[PDB]
Amino acid sequence: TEDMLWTEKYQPQTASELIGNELAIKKLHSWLKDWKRRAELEERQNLKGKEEESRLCNTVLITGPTGVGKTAAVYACAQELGFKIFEVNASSQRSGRQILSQLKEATQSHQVDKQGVNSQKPCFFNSKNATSLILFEEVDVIF
Amino acid sequence: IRNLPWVEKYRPQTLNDLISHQDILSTIQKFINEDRLPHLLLYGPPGTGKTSTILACAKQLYKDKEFGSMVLELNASDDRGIDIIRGPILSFASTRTIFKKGFKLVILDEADAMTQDAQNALRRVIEKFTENTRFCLICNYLSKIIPALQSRCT
Amino acid sequence: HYELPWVEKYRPVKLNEIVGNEDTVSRLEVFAREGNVPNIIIAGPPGTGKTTSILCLARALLGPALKDAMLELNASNDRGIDVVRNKIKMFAQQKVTLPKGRHKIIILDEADSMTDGAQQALRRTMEIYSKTTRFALACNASDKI
Amino acid sequence: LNVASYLQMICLTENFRTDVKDFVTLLTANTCDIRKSILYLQFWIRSGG
Amino acid sequence: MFEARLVQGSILKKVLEALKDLINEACWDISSSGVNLQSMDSSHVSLVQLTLRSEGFDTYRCDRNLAMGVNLTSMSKILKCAGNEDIITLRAEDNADTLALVFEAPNQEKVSDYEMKLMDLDVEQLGIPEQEYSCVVKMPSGEFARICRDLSHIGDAVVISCAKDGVKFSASGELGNGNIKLSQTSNVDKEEEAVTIEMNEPVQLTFALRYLNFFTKATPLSSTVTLSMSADVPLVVEYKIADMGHLKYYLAPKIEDEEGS
Amino acid sequence: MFEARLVQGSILKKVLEALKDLINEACWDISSSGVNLQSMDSSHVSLVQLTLRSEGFDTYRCDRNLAMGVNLTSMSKILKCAGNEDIITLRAEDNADTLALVFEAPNQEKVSDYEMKLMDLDVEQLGIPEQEYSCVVKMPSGEFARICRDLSHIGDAVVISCAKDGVKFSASGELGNGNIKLSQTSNVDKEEEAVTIEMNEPVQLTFALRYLNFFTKATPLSSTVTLSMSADVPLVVEYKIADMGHLKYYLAPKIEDEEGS
Amino acid sequence: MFEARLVQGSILKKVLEALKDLINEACWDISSSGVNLQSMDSSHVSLVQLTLRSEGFDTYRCDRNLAMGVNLTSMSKILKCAGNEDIITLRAEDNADTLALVFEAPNQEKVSDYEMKLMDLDVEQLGIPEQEYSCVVKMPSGEFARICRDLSHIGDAVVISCAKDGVKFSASGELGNGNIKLSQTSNVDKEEEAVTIEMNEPVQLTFALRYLNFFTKATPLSSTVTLSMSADVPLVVEYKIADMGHLKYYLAPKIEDEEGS
Numbered sequence A: 001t002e003d004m005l006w007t008e009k010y011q012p013q014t015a016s017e018l019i020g021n022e023l024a025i026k027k028l029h030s031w032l033k034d035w036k037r038r039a040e041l042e043e044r045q046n047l048k049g050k051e052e053e054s055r056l057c058n059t060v061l062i063t064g065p066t067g068v069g070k071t072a073a074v075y076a077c078a079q080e081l082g083f084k085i086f087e088v089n090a091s092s093q094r095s096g097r098q099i100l101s102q103l104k105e106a107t108q109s110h111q112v113d114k115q116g117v118n119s120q121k122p123c124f125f126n127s128k129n130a131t132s133l134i135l136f137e138e139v140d141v142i143f
Numbered sequence B: 001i002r003n004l005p006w007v008e009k010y011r012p013q014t015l016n017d018l019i020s021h022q023d024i025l026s027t028i029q030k031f032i033n034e035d036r037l038p039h040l041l042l043y044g045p046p047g048t049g050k051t052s053t054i055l056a057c058a059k060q061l062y063k064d065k066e067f068g069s070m071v072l073e074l075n076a077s078d079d080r081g082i083d084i085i086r087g088p089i090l091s092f093a094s095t096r097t098i099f100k101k102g103f104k105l106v107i108l109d110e111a112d113a114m115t116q117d118a119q120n121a122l123r124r125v126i127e128k129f130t131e132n133t134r135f136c137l138i139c140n141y142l143s144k145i146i147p148a149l150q151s152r153c154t
Numbered sequence C: 001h002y003e004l005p006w007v008e009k010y011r012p013v014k015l016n017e018i019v020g021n022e023d024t025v026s027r028l029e030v031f032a033r034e035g036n037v038p039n040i041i042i043a044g045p046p047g048t049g050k051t052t053s054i055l056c057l058a059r060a061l062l063g064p065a066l067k068d069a070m071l072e073l074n075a076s077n078d079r080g081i082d083v084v085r086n087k088i089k090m091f092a093q094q095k096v097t098l099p100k101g102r103h104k105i106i107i108l109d110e111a112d113s114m115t116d117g118a119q120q121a122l123r124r125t126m127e128i129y130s131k132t133t134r135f136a137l138a139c140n141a142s143d144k145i
Numbered sequence D: 001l002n003v004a005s006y007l008q009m010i011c012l013t014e015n016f017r018t019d020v021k022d023f024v025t026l027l028t029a030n031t032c033d034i035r036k037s038i039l040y041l042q043f044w045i046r047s048g049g
Numbered sequence E, F, G: 001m002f003e004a005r006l007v008q009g010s011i012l013k014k015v016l017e018a019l020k021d022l023i024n025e026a027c028w029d030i031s032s033s034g035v036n037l038q039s040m041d042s043s044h045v046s047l048v049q050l051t052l053r054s055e056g057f058d059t060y061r062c063d064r065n066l067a068m069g070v071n072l073t074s075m076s077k078i079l080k081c082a083g084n085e086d087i088i089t090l091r092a093e094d095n096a097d098t099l100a101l102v103f104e105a106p107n108q109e110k111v112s113d114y115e116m117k118l119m120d121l122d123v124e125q126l127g128i129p130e131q132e133y134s135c136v137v138k139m140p141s142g143e144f145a146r147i148c149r150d151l152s153h154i155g156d157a158v159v160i161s162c163a164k165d166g167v168k169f170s171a172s173g174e175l176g177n178g179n180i181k182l183s184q185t186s187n188v189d190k191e192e193e194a195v196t197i198e199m200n201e202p203v204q205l206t207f208a209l210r211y212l213n214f215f216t217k218a219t220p221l222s223s224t225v226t227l228s229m230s231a232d233v234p235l236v237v238e239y240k241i242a243d244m245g246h247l248k249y250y251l252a253p254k255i256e257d258e259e260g261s
């Protein structure tokens, strides 16, 4: 009476649920927590109105072997810290014009719906506040 | 002037001009005349009479005007891979001649030069379109043809 | 009007009409009876029973919903990167009403003939659409996958 | 050993008792691919052990 | 069991031409009150709400509330094959996985029964409170399309002001800045629509003009468009289709970074 | 010496705007009866039979029987250089390599000349033996073109079934199928226009779609079209153009396997 | 301080679309006589000499000679905002890096203040002397663009030979050969379509097609065109834009390579 695979039935919903790679998990969680803090401070500055020392780079890269848990750790950290993942897989046509003109505004503009069921993380294809976060999955796969 | 080779000149235009194989020639003629021609796998050393056998069979089945439209002959060494199985072979096997109703013939000479994936698709082309067309594979080595493709043919 | 070959006239229609590979065929039998089959790859020599067991398992799982819940692709089909991106993903996102425990099935026969780029483009499709769609692949050389 | 105990945990949630050595052989067979071991564990447990 | 008989196919054709390149998939939340479509962008920064009343259809009938998710390329390439003045039945069963469009007499000779396979997806809820706004303005829709297209060549961002003096459109880029002013006493002669304002306090915001050109493709749906703005809530572009319903666009403003003074 | 001057250049534009993508080479047979075009598709699945009578031509002179094999892409490029109400004249010699198109002035001062080389080729000489058909209907051509271009969006192969009621079109694809039924009773602006039924046994077959679209690309040639098919003989559509020619496309049915599964 | 007024935007839009691809940047020099534009293309084979007289402007004000040069992508993107009828203000200061376009809309009060930045081109004034031209032709523009598209589809190389009865167009290429003949037709109802011949000697010359197509892009600028051909001089095309000025297109001919003897 179950319709779910055991990978997504037992998917880690918390960064403490993943097995191994604790230093990499802590690094990614600290980076995403700093980004969430920057987003909340931006919201506070907006409310008030109406970077070598920080060294917060705009992009992390994650590498390792197949099936170790890179995507699972990314999704668990973004779920814990309230991010919304916009995923670009190799399983959809991602050429430069389409990915720019259909996902740049996720980074550059606010979320129109910030509360509700928006914690669900969608994908990209073309045939409490939640901060946007892009995830390019399997960047080495270039067609 | 013209001095044509004796290989071409003394060719068995009819199935009765072959000299050595007589059991399988009788079997092939009996496949022809009761309208039960299967997929064939003519294999052996060169110069034995496989191409001559299939050309006499196609002359027995089709005519001169419909020879250029009902039987298609390929050499797999000219272009290997599935760019020719998914392509001329698939479109030939899946289409139908407008007024000519019957069955088509594919003569795939030098089938052992075909790659493994091209054979893996040619077997499926054979399976899906058995009634529309028959396939005759001519080769030297049976060890260079996958058993799945061998088993569809006699 | 012709005599069907005995490989098709006597082709098995159930999972108990398959001789050899008793453990794996038994596991496929209990999965076909109970449901919720995972994404499987069946590797072996030619003529073993892989396509037969995959088709019988899909038939026993689906039943009358075979014509709408099953998408089968051989090596004679295209199965390219663009086919994986449009047709496979469109069938995976397609709504098909099925009894609980039964999923839509994408059968990829002769997975050795699939290009490496198409297999790379089919990686996430095997993952996200796993609550509605399952993948059953048959292959001879598992190293080509 | 960490992945072996993790798989033992997910098997014990399914009311199965398994030894560490068999899971260690499976994990050193598939080179600690966690998802592959999870999926093969699902296939093997749900088919009766 | 559900039937919805659109009086003219031009309504659905213009709707799907409005949502064509902006929305990825269309979800219809259908009940006894009518037809609702709250679909967000692929980037999830712009939301399209479309409400069609039950009385606006030629004949409307429902049995239970249900949601249908259809791909938009397929629905668009099917609605491009529909008669403009002809009547269109939309039809679906209780729990089936298909949606039929019956075009009766597109060329006065044939009946057409097109079918679409529905998709399945987690239907997010977009019910937002109807808070008051600070700056509403009645201005024409053909003019909105014209000036949005016109300033769209200059750059990629819109700097928009609403105050008592009117609506201000600034577009700065490598080409050079361009400014657009709207006046209350100003009235067009193309359609004779006069600008009126019910403003509360001045607001400065900035958006992406590409999604504004995507929004303005619904110009033939209504003669006039109402723009609503305030400091916190997103931009609202409203078309009121007479006896049909209303189509609103919610566009969030761009994030701006305060400089380190 | 061959010299054929037409009443209008529009009919030559419309007759062969459909053969640009379907016909690889146009073979034209010139005799005292008229102009013949019996061409074969490169996949040997479609045939085009076109007959131009001497009565329909403004002028027609011919001393011998000619077989002229011409390319389509460049010739379509030069007939993109033609009007509608004007007059064209085709001139060729007995043993030359030219195709002289004399182009009467649309502006009454601009007389044009076009020369094309002649590509010699063997002729299959496939004459249609002109069987009888068990399912014949008449249908207005614009509707058939609309229906074919509509079903091209859905799938790649259509099922055409003719019976005692009328022509039924089906197309099952990935997006979901689409069905069309034609009823005998038809009410249009004209007094007399309907689907007719003259049939012996109902026949249902399956056909490729690009070839059917290329067949329907010549719909402004004639007002009506005639569809004839039966169980063994292929599909044929026939455009009997007004008092100057007839045209006749044969399409063979495709081989299906999901019917028997 | 530049203050120029274009009474109609149609001429400015059409002259922009005429040289949109033809030349890289427009360099305007301004005197008390009016507006002048002497611009050379990227390949340095074509010259544009355009003169707007001052009385064609409703208001004109120029304190000093004003020379500036600005790219044409921004121009192509700024007069795409001009309507088919409106009044336009070209505004500039005595010494700045910004040119302003002010559109007064058909609205009662809606200004378009579009200020673009300069980039300070360094160009030279290539003064061309006036001389005797052996052949002058009066020719309508639309059908001349039709001849340009006629010979475009045949071959890139264009040949024009002026004979005692008029002009002859020839295109020889891979596909074949195309010829277009014009006779003396000065006796017609309207003086526009009359092709008057006041030539002295026959001349035949070869020119390209891309820059020719860029020249025929100015078809709606005026009803009629003056064609000027003499020995060892560039092709001259004259547009007489009524009540405001005249435009000249110069194309350096392709030099035919003579074979050795």
Ligand SMILES: Nc1ncnc2c1ncn2[C@@H]1O[C@H](COP(=O)(O)OP(=O)(O)OP(O)(O)=S)[C@@H](O)[C@H]1O
Pocket (backbone or CB within 6 Å): A006, A007, A008, A010, A011, A012, A017, A018, A019, A020, A065, A066, A067, A068, A069, A070, A071, A072, A073, D034, D035, D038
């Ligand atoms: N460290 C882990 N802890 C718990 N579950 C894991 C772990 N690694 C993998 N999984 C499971 O495996 C599933 C898929 O793992 P992924 O994170 O997608 O693998 P990956 O690191 O992305 O490598 P790729 O994408 O296949 S190359 C997850 O949904 C989990 O169920």
Ligand SMILES: Nc1ncnc2c1ncn2[C@@H]1O[C@H](COP(=O)(O)OP(=O)(O)OP(O)(O)=S)[C@@H](O)[C@H]1O
Pocket (backbone or CB within 6 Å): B006, B007, B008, B009, B010, B011, B012, B017, B018, B019, B020, B021, B044, B045, B046, B047, B048, B049, B050, B051, B052, B053, B138, B139, B140
């Ligand atoms: N059984 C035979 N009887 C008479 N002549 C034969 C016979 N077999 C071959 N020949 C002669 O050999 C010539 C060429 O034989 P082919 O049948 O073309 O060789 P093949 O069987 O095609 O071998 P490969 O593998 O294709 S090179 C013919 O033209 C005949 O002259």
Ligand SMILES: Nc1ncnc2c1ncn2[C@@H]1O[C@H](COP(=O)(O)OP(=O)(O)OP(O)(O)=S)[C@@H](O)[C@H]1O
Pocket (backbone or CB within 6 Å): B148, C006, C007, C008, C010, C011, C012, C017, C018, C019, C020, C044, C045, C046, C047, C048, C049, C050, C051, C052, C053, C138, C139, C140
């Ligand atoms: N285990 C088996 N039990 C009974 N019949 C079998 C078995 N394996 C094969 N057959 C027969 O062989 C025919 C073809 O076998 P398939 O299972 O279709 O081929 P396969 O096992 O998929 O191997 P490949 O790699 O596809 S060639 C079937 O239709 C059966 O008639």
Ligand SMILES: [Mg+2]
Pocket (backbone or CB within 6 Å): A070, A071, A072, A137
């Ligand atoms: Mg991953």
Ligand SMILES: [Mg+2]
Pocket (backbone or CB within 6 Å): B051, B052, B109
């Ligand atoms: Mg041979």
Ligand SMILES: [Mg+2]
Pocket (backbone or CB within 6 Å): C051, C109
């Ligand atoms: Mg098989």
